[PDB]
Design an enzyme around this catalytic site. Structure first.
Site, PDB file in Angstrom:
ATOM      1  N   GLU A 134     -28.449 -41.175 -41.052  1.00 55.43           N
ATOM      2  CA  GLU A 134     -29.699 -40.701 -40.480  1.00 55.43           C
ATOM      3  C   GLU A 134     -30.497 -41.830 -39.796  1.00 55.43           C
ATOM      4  OE1 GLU A 134     -30.244 -37.995 -39.216  1.00 55.43           O
ATOM      5  OE2 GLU A 134     -29.817 -36.762 -40.944  1.00 55.43           O
ATOM      6  N   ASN A 158     -36.744 -34.823 -29.913  1.00 57.02           N
ATOM      7  CA  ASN A 158     -35.928 -33.667 -29.557  1.00 57.02           C
ATOM      8  C   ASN A 158     -36.643 -32.971 -28.427  1.00 57.02           C
ATOM      9  OD1 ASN A 158     -34.174 -33.931 -31.996  1.00 57.02           O
ATOM     10  ND2 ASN A 158     -36.116 -33.493 -33.023  1.00 57.02           N
ATOM     11  N   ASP A 189     -37.234 -28.864 -28.472  1.00 58.25           N
ATOM     12  CA  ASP A 189     -38.370 -28.274 -29.162  1.00 58.25           C
ATOM     13  C   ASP A 189     -39.582 -29.197 -29.285  1.00 58.25           C
ATOM     14  OD1 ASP A 189     -37.224 -29.841 -31.326  1.00 58.25           O
ATOM     15  OD2 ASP A 189     -38.183 -28.486 -32.759  1.00 58.25           O
ATOM     16  N   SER A 201     -40.110 -31.897 -30.781  1.00 59.32           N
ATOM     17  CA  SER A 201     -40.379 -32.487 -32.091  1.00 59.32           C
ATOM     18  C   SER A 201     -39.784 -33.888 -32.210  1.00 59.32           C
ATOM     19  CB  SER A 201     -39.805 -31.584 -33.193  1.00 59.32           C
ATOM     20  OG  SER A 201     -38.392 -31.500 -33.116  1.00 59.32           O
ATOM     21  N   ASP A 222     -38.111 -36.795 -35.186  1.00 57.75           N
ATOM     22  CA  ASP A 222     -37.587 -37.041 -36.537  1.00 57.75           C
ATOM     23  C   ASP A 222     -38.104 -38.417 -36.938  1.00 57.75           C
ATOM     24  OD1 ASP A 222     -36.046 -34.667 -36.188  1.00 57.75           O
ATOM     25  OD2 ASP A 222     -34.279 -35.774 -35.568  1.00 57.75           O
ATOM     26  N   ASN A 230     -38.343 -34.166 -39.648  1.00 62.23           N
ATOM     27  CA  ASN A 230     -38.864 -33.533 -38.433  1.00 62.23           C
ATOM     28  C   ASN A 230     -40.345 -33.108 -38.461  1.00 62.23           C
ATOM     29  OD1 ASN A 230     -38.804 -30.728 -36.602  1.00 62.23           O
ATOM     30  ND2 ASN A 230     -37.645 -32.410 -35.710  1.00 62.23           N
TER      31      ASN A 230
END
Length: 130
Positions: free
Chosen positions: A35, A46, A49, A51, A53, A60
């Site tokens: 990750e 992202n 959408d 968003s 992380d 998120n």
């Protein structure tokens, strides 16, 4: 901060992550590895959408933390996404536990499924004495 393998392991364990909801410490370690590489300052946007992380577990902004710039955002963890880029990972662990409390468990993270699920993940904790 970029944690060293065994340093992260002993920490996650003192924070009650080993076996949390049937999830082994080795599994949490495998997720963090792919990750973010153990880096608390990891981020990934992202565009689809809008968003982002955040952190070592890549939590998120759309559902878990508030970054103030994500549409239709929920703050299920009730914290600022900024608290998730800190050297002290107490808040990230707490929000990680909340994520896995949903029916999907650790499977919420696509990376964990692709790289950790059903695979031997023992290497992640061997030699740390946890």
């Amino acid at each position: 901060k970029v944690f060293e393998r065994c340093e992260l392991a002993r920490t996650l364990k003192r924070l009650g992550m080993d076996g949390y909801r049937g999830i082994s410490l080795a599994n949490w370690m495998c997720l963090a590895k792919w990750e973010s590489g153990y880096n608390t300052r990891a981020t990934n946007y992202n565009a689809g959408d809008r968003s982002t992380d955040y952190g070592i577990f890549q939590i998120n902004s759309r559902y878990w933390c508030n970054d103030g710039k994500t549409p239709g955002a929920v703050n299920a963890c009730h914290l600022s996404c900024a608290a998730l880029l800190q050297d002290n990972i107490a808040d990230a662990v707490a929000c990680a536990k909340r994520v896995v409390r949903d029916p999907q468990g650790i499977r919420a993270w696509v990376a964990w499924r692709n790289r950790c699920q059903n695979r031997d993940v023992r290497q992640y904790v061997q030699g740390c004495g946890v």
